[PDB]
Amino acid sequence: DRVSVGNLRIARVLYDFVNNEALPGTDIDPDSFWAGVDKVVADLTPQNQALLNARDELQAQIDKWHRRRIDMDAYRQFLTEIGYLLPEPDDFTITTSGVDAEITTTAGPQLVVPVLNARFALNAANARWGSLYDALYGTDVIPEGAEKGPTYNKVRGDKVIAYARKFLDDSVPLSSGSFGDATGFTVQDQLVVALPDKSTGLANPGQFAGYTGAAESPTSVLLINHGLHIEILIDPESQVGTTDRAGVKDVILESAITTIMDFEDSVAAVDAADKVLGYRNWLGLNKGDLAALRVLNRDRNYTAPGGGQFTLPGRSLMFVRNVGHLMTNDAIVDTDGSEVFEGIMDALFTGLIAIHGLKASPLINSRTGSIYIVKPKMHGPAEVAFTCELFSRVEDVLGLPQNTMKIGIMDEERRTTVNLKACIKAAADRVVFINTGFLDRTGDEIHTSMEAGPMVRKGTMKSQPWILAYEDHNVDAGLAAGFSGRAQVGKGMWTMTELMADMVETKIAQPRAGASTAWVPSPTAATLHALHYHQVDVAAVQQGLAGKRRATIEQLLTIPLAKELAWAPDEIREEVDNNCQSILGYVVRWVDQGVGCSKVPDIHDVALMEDRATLRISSQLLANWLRHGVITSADVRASLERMAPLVDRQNAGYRPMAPNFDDSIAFLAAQELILSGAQQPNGYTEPILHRRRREFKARAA
């Protein structure tokens, strides 16, 4: 079933894929590459294993501590004693180089898409440019007599048009009058726009940055604001442009400035066939020839306010997100049976692939010659140090100069949060971002303090002292480490796919909090969230936050215990009902269809775009309420059974779970996640999930 190379037994599909598709073009000797792999896996595996065991020893110690008991003073002293809370390093500045300006300079939206889905991955890459009009018309941003019918509704149209003209006014203002009264654009020398009883220019001429067509009647005017590009498309002959008083047919926003192709929480990849699919798609993006023709967009040409032709990138600068340290995968199995660590595997294979995106021989990702890898679920700075070591070993096997493989550190584990400055310092010449999330981090929060008592409800976690301090701490640390002109400070994902008006209203808080990037669920959402980077001068904000220490180690460690009495019976029911629905709705699709991400209607029927992290939080909360006797096993079974046919309801378009639950592999998976969730390492969900997806796939054979 396998190819023996050194002490490794590689799955043939994987072996064949690396040799036939990946290796050619990289100037890496196939046999050499394979011994390289063999070497790295043997060398780094016990360290990898050492790190994983340290996690369990720490959690055990913490579990016992709580069981013998809150004295927040000795608690913090205990953590220090065991090596969980480490000493905070001296002040420093990251020194990472050869990084693209999308990362170092531009604040903008950031897309995340499951790599296994070439259609989504294609749109993601093409989402760097996005029509504002389409985004406004199609979503609930413009309210509905402007209803969306089977045909275009001109009423909705000039509402769209009005909104856009106002956007231009706030973003690239004219010295006199508004864009709403524009009648035409000309390029005298510079960008002059004709008003009815006037003619005016850009209040700051530097905002003009190019155009197309002829200077007298340009086909489009390129504008720039806060490093982001705005393009007004001008075609009086077009249907839209015929009714526009300056012949404007559309406004195009530079939107998803970067994208993350995800091998982690948004996919289901449980054996060697899945991984190859992922790697193959990642290959196609890097060579630049993936298609379905819908091709990757080529770059864009323009004319400076009196000069030559310059080209702007037309694709989203791509990061890849490898899996984390925990999992093994039988794509590579050792001589004596043991599955190799998935993360080590990802570093070599996605790193090898990325080499193709460094040159044309057609499409290039990084222009400065870096490979950008996001690493998730690290706990503490020894774990960061190992990842950097993994990368340096890989860059040797690949022939790449050291420091080629950049790191984006996800801050989503408690032991990383309280040692963030040191985690950053361990990657000080590789790091190109940090980022915060609600979902994994809360999962970890619940699991680390599982034994201390029952946690507050899920909806309530969003406002807890620990999480507010954690968000602020992330930014402070990034800024103090000198991120402003160097790396991204990122914030989490907007998960309500349909609530775009709501998104435009609230998600502005993230750049206001000094985040240079944040996550959006789609190309449409990317365009809309780009509006926020125009309103908010992030570099200004980041400059204002300098030297500020707005979160103390005492605040970070405030465990979210519910106060006594707390809830009335029906509130508890709603909570478990809601959690069981989230688990089922997601798990049914993960196990039966290997679809890691899609729109799962929640209890109140909102379309949520959640990944595996939602599993982690929902399950850990229930296991917590189980452990402290808030609810019983008799309670949990009940809801899980009640919600099961309703998930079945929300899935018309599949194999029902009700009424014969005990023979549904998904229903068993979801149930296991609850009842044994307290036993899962850091409440991770992969172990139970990977097992069951494999189980189900052995029903399909």
Residue numbers in the entry: 3 to 71, 76 to 150, 153 to 197, 199 to 301, 311 to 379, 384 to 675, 679 to 726
Which sentences did the original study use to describe this structure?
GlcB generates malate and coenzyme A (CoA) from glyoxylate and acetyl coenzyme A (AcCoA) following the conversion of isocitrate to succinate and glyoxylate by ICL. Because of the essentiality of the glyoxylate shunt in infection and the absence of it in humans, both ICL and GlcB are attractive targets for drug discovery. The active site is an ∼20 Å-long tunnel located at the interface of the TIM barrel and a loop comprising residues 616–633 of domain II. A Mg2+ ion required for activity is bound at the bottom of the active site tunnel in an octahedral coordination by one oxygen each from the carboxylate side chains of Glu-434 and Asp-462, two water molecules, and two oxygens of glyoxylate.
Finally, we obtained crystals of ligand-free GlcB to prove that the open lid protein conformation discovered through fragment is indeed corresponding to the apo form of the enzyme. The best quality malate synthase crystals are packed in the P43212 space group and always have density for bound glyoxylate, which tends to co-purify with the enzyme. We diluted the enzyme to 0.1 mg/ml in assay buffer containing 5 mm Mg2+ and incubated it with substrates to remove residual glyoxylate. After 1 h, we concentrated the enzyme back to 5 mg/ml, extensively washing it with an excess of the same buffer. This sample yielded a P43212 space group crystal that diffracted to 2.2 Å, showing well defined density for the CoA binding loop in the “in” conformation and an open active site lid. Interestingly, there is no electron density for Mg2+; the peak at the corresponding position is of the similar intensity to surrounding waters (2 σ in the 2Fo − Fc map). Collection of multiple crystals were required to achieve this uniform conformation of the moving loop structure with the data still of lesser quality than the glyoxylate-bound P43212 crystals used for fragment soaking. The apo structure has the “in” conformation for the CoA binding loop and the open active site lid conformation originally discovered through the fragment-bound structures, with a disordered Mg2+ ion. Combining our observations from all the crystal structures and published kinetic studies thus far, we propose that glyoxylate binds first to the apo enzyme (active site lid open and CoA binding loop “in”).
